[PDB]
Design a protein around this ligand. Structure first.
Ligand SMILES: NC(=O)C[C@H](N)C(=O)O
Ligand SMILES: NC(=O)C[C@H](N)C(=O)O
Lengths: 368, 353
């Protein structure tokens, strides 16, 4: 019944010859530069671990640490602070160059190695029986930035990653401030790279990224800016200018940001969250806001292949980009379902319904 | 009768990370529903959890007995194996028994179901071929069937071939369904693959274990019940052929040492046939039973956790026997620095009849 559809029915589904294989619940928020909710799927306020989708907030805390500017991190270094990189040789090399800029060593890192986020890099490592180490961590840039901050303020470096350290006090405050939340409304766990990692309502992830894009707009327009807004504009510009530092070759975030050529930034969170900050455009105005826009998505069960398909579908439905811009992402939008003998056996479909405009006022939209 | 909201939930520091909807059916030897999670009649692609039904169609084909397939061979017919060297070797030995060659196979190679095997392949620049297919044993069996009735081999995998007619008929008969109540797609190994209500998958495996109980007891058995008993015995005796080293199905079957068989379906279905036992009697049935599970979003890690939790709640096996599956039951959640970051919980409740 098309007239009784509900947020609990917002799914992405794979089929085999039209027979349902898997289904995945979708949550999404689309917000303006103040965080006002414009459009949604599922539960737009779902309490959600942002994971590395919070890295730009961490980068901001680093860049606002007094004395960090003296180290001379450049835009590519800052993009690496914002990264979940593929551990390509260029990422490892930039991590080492950033350590050198602060006169630290790999032994000062408190993150550990892991298999690469890139299948092609992992393949090279397997052939050499290479064991990744701290300097290969997908989060190495943020860890180097945290060490830089710890050094700059005269804190110890030994536990820069622990919650009682002033660098982590700074991160925690910065995250809550960007979300416009009280500290008690942000919860904290520990991430795979051994840093505190925040959870907050999903819409507030979109709010962070709307603020990034909004700051980019104000900077480009030559408006006088607070030190925080200037830093948020710098982070936006760094990510958009060096999107390969943020992820790597063949990675969704890199292909997405290259396709849009400065119009937006986007960032993956592990276990299938995604955040996009969209600069003001004809598209955002058609969506009904006079400023920048933020988008946040979570696939409830954590499937990344479905995440990229859903994010690309949502961009198409919001009219963000051109068919030509978004077709650089076609392999993520409609994932290949081809068996071992070259036969297409099924596909992906998007039975979810954006809400925010039409329905009978007696239709309840219960966030679920 | 509305399906419960049954989930397995992962957390990070007590904060919800992912959740996964669980469907499960526990059925007696006639397929009567005894316990359930979620929607026990969910229309579900059985994928390779249907392999024992396909092995039954092979074994019932006229003349297949003359090739001399043994119990390990039949286990391979029932398998989604890890493409270990010993699985490839047995595939080749089975092809030799029917005087066929790898070129006759109509399945294709793929990355191994074992990450460890696949890393060894990557290290050696190895490109998997037809003989490496996790379904190679079933394909050799279907080739053997085609040859045995003189059907000719080029399209043994196609729906219009009498071998697939036999498979299609056998699946519906084991489910006790009309042909129209089974739907058909195409699998990764390029065979027809069935979808039917999830409880009927449990019914297949209850019939497998019931047949083993009746064979053991010396009962008069149909040729079909005799063959189902043989399939059960083949899987339990050669569980390494069904999957491989470190695989859940192999470790599950070794742990239970003949009390049950279990089989994975791709995209996170699972089926178990349990021979009659003190545990099954405690659950309120006088015969064998079947268990079928589907994780709605297709997550395999969560599948194995849920299946092992279900076995604990059902009392199937001793605590000592189930502890061999501890690493599947509560998957590790330890970060790159050795710190435990989270866990898995099972807020579902089995509902009974
Ligand atoms: N990259 C992410 O989203 C978080 C991951 N667990 C990490 O810290 O490496
Ligand atoms: N192994 C399974 O469950 C089916 C798999 N896609 C295959 O045909 O190889």
């Amino acid at each position: 019944d098309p007239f009784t559809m509900t947020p609990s029915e917002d799914f992405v589904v794979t089929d085999r010859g039209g027979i349902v294989e898997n289904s995945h619940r979708v949550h999404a928020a689309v917000v303006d530069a103040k965080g006002r909710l414009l459009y949604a799927l599922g539960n737009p306020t779902r309490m959600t671990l942002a994971r590395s989708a919070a890295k730009p907030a961490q980068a901001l805390a680093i860049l606002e640490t007094e004395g960090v500017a003296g180290y001379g991190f450049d835009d590519a270094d800052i993009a690496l602070m914002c990264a979940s990189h593929s551990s390509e040789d260029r990422h490892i090399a930039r991590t080492r160059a950033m350590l050198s800029k602060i006169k630290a060593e790999e032994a000062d890192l408190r993150c550990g190695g892991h298999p690469s986020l890139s299948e092609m890099v992992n393949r090279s490592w397997i052939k050499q029986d290479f064991i990744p180490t701290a300097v290969c961590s997908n989060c190495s840039g943020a860890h180097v930035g945290m060490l830089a901050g710890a050094r700059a303020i005269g804190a110890g470096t030994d536990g820069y990653h622990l919650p009682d350290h002033p660098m982590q006090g700074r991160v925690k405050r910065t995250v809550a401030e960007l979300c416009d939340l009280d500290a008690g409304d942000v919860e904290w766990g520990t991430d795979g790279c051994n840093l505190p990692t925040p959870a907050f309502p999903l819409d507030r992830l979109g709010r962070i990224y709307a603020k990034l894009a909004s700051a980019a707009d104000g900077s480009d327009a030559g408006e006088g800016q607070s030190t925080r807004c200037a830093a948020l504009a710098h982070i936006f510009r760094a990510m958009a200018r060096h999107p390969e530092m943020v992820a790597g070759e063949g990675r969704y975030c890199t292909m997405l940001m290259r396709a849009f050529d400065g119009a937006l930034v986007g960032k993956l969170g592990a276990d299938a969250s995604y955040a996009i900050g969209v600069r003001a455009s004809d598209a955002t105005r058609q969506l009904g806001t006079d400023g920048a826009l933020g988008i946040s998505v979570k696939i409830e069960d954590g499937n990344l292949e479905m995440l990229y398909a859903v994010v690309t579908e949502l961009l198409e439905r919001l009219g963000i980009g051109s068919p030509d811009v978004r077709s650089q992402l076609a392999s993520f939008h409609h994932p290949q379902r081809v068996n071992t003998m070259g036969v297409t056996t099924g596909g992906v479909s998007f039975p979810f319904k954006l809400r925010g405009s039409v329905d009978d006022p007696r239709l309840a939209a219960v966030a679920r």
